């Protein structure tokens with residue numbers, strides 16, 4: 044590899060190379076100790 | 078040929094090149110950023126005589142629309158394209174004019190206050206010009222930038238003209254807030270503070286940045302007001318609210334006093350009409366400045382859960398109901414205490430009374446938890462007294478519903494806001510909290526709109542960026558830089574209502590808020606749900622608080638000591654490190670690290686310049702100006718989204734590059750338990766109440782219906798760890 048690495052300057056081009064066409068209880072509460 | 082209209086006004090031919098070079102200036106030192114992309118994105122439509130400004134405008138929004146998670150830099154890319162436009166639209170040229178020259182120019186224009194030209198000689202100005210780093214404008218993320226183009230900057234709202242710049246703004250405020258300072262430390266602090274805020278190390282309230290250095294003398298943000306059952310009292314409240322909403326301030330009304338419906342008036346000559354009639358008026362006042370009632374004027378009302386109309390009140394925020402039976406423009410905060418929760422766990426009832434049909438029943442609620450308990454049972458078993466029984470399991474249930482149904486009905490545990498408050502329950506009992514829900518200050522009713530006695534909680538606050546300090550120690554400097562600077566505003570901002578000025582100068586309550594807590598916990602690996610941040614949090618907040626009290630205590634020598642300091646428990650030798658709920662030790666085993674006793678005495682001997690320095694408030698705009706995370710609550714997603722005036726805004730969470738794993742997004746949390754546990758810890762050091770909000774996800778609950786069980790369960794959890802208040806319940810909407 045000679046050319047410097049890069050991120051595709053154009054990504055918009057890809058478009059053309061892709062596949063082209065309430066519960067309440069006192070039960071659970073009773074136990075808590077605030 | 079082709080034409081173009083340079084912002085200068087003159088004409089020119091189209092120069093396709095000149096555009097490119099501009100994008101380059103931005104793409105400079107960036108990746109994943111395609112110069113060609115933004116162009117095609119923008120579909121920039123050319124037409125003769127098109128202004129160059131508009132052309133430039135197009136790309137700005139285009140680049141901002143390409144700010145995706147995969148393109149974190151685009152956020153900064155567009156940011157650079159933006160900063161350019163602004164500076165040139167206010168200076169004619171890309172490089173802003175000297176500190177002195179500018180300050181003067183804008184003065185005679187009515188935009189900058191000449192107050193500076195008098196407290197600072199040319200030399201000092203041209204000197205400060207050195208500290209100014211215009212280049213810091215290139216350190217903004219477009220999210221923050223867009224906001225600056227409106228709220229923060231000095232500009233002409235009719236014409237559009239922008240008169241000011243991003244560091245220009247910073248420095249002026251720093252000095253204009255330290256002007257009345259000794260000749261020797263004054264230039265110094267002017268810089269040390271400038272850098273502290275210019276580097277996003279300490280964010281300040283929106284109201285401040287705009288007006289320090291302009292004509293207006295008012296910095297007030299959130300205020301509280303207690304109304305008296307007495308007819309006259311309410312009329313005053315009505316006026317006050319309007320005076321304060323007229324200066325765009327959030328309102329914190331407490332009508333828990335209005336005597337209940339049916340209660341005697343004048344003996345038996347006339348029976349009372351109820352609280353509701355008085356409550357709705359309160360709303361028209363806060364909206365006295367609002368167009369269509371759609372936006373503006375925020376009023377949060379507070380009241381006792383044992384009120385004789387508690388049932389009446391819950392319905393009102395709900396939209397499903399008759400008009401005259403619903404006040405839906407304002408939020409409500411249900412007041413609860415230790416006896417209340419008890420009844421629920423015992424499936425026992427809750428006798429509803431009227432504030433005026435019972436003696437000592439109210440006052441006791443706020444200050445003493447025994448009396449209210451002793452008194453309660455007395456009348457409870459008394460028949461003479463208009464009462465109304467309702468199964469606890471039946472009440473708490475209703476309340477909780479409206480809370481998830483709207484997400485505006487908050488909660489406030491009184492006992493904790495008095496047994497863990499810098500103030501004394503007897504002398505200055507806290508009866509209420511503000512719209513933001515984060516302010517625990519004492520309150521008094523007003524016989525007149527300008528009553529001498531009246532107290533109007535005034536809160537001024539600033540914020541510390543945890544994502545901007547390398548070690549806990551760095552706070553100690555920033556602490557004094559904030560506490561000092563803040564305390565100064567109190568003497569620079571005029572107070573509309575007298576009851577406020579007196580109540581303000583009196584205790585000088587200072588609210589300090591921390592932001593970017595999400596990034597912090599992630600930068601250390603810990604999270605909210607596992608609670609591995611419990612200790613990390615304890616140690617962190619322990620510091621933030623320590624240095625603040627030391628910064629204040631220190632000032633308790635330099636500029637006197639507090640007017641009312643005696644009232645507070647701090648003077649009584651009581652510290653906020655020995656009042657927290659004992660339940661907490663159970664989720665945190667990180668012992669204190671900085672000598673506290675040193676201040677326990679230093680503050681006994683000297684005092685404090687303020688009455689409060691610790692509070693937590695959720696701020697929309699302080700957080701994004703530093704590209705930081707909102708208050709403490711974790712972000713809902715890596716790619717933050719919002720609509721600006723333009724309507725597209727993107728803010729990548731601090732450092733998405735290595736931080737993706739460590740972030741526990743608000744919805745990624747298994748349950749609310751984790752969140753609370755950390756909050757309860759913060760309280761152990763917070764003088765005033767954290768804006769902790771609960772979040773639920775129906776999509777995760779059997780039969781897709783948040784179970785009442787869980788909702789109630791959580792409330793107990795908060796009360797168990799000494800949590801002061803509750804804030805938005807936001808459900809998992811968008812499905």
Ligand SMILES: Nc1ncnc2c1ncn2[C@@H]1O[C@H](COP(=O)(O)OP(=O)(O)OP(=O)(O)O)[C@@H](O)[C@H]1O
Nearest residue numbers: 081083084085089090091092095096099129132133
């Ligand atoms: N002749 C032109 N044709 C098309 N676009 C241009 C032209 N000249 C400038 N622009 C673009 O419009 C934007 C505005 O440039 P600027 O803010 O500097 O104000 P200006 O009035 O255009 O002054 P100048 O063009 O001399 O720099 C730039 O992004 C630039 O790319």
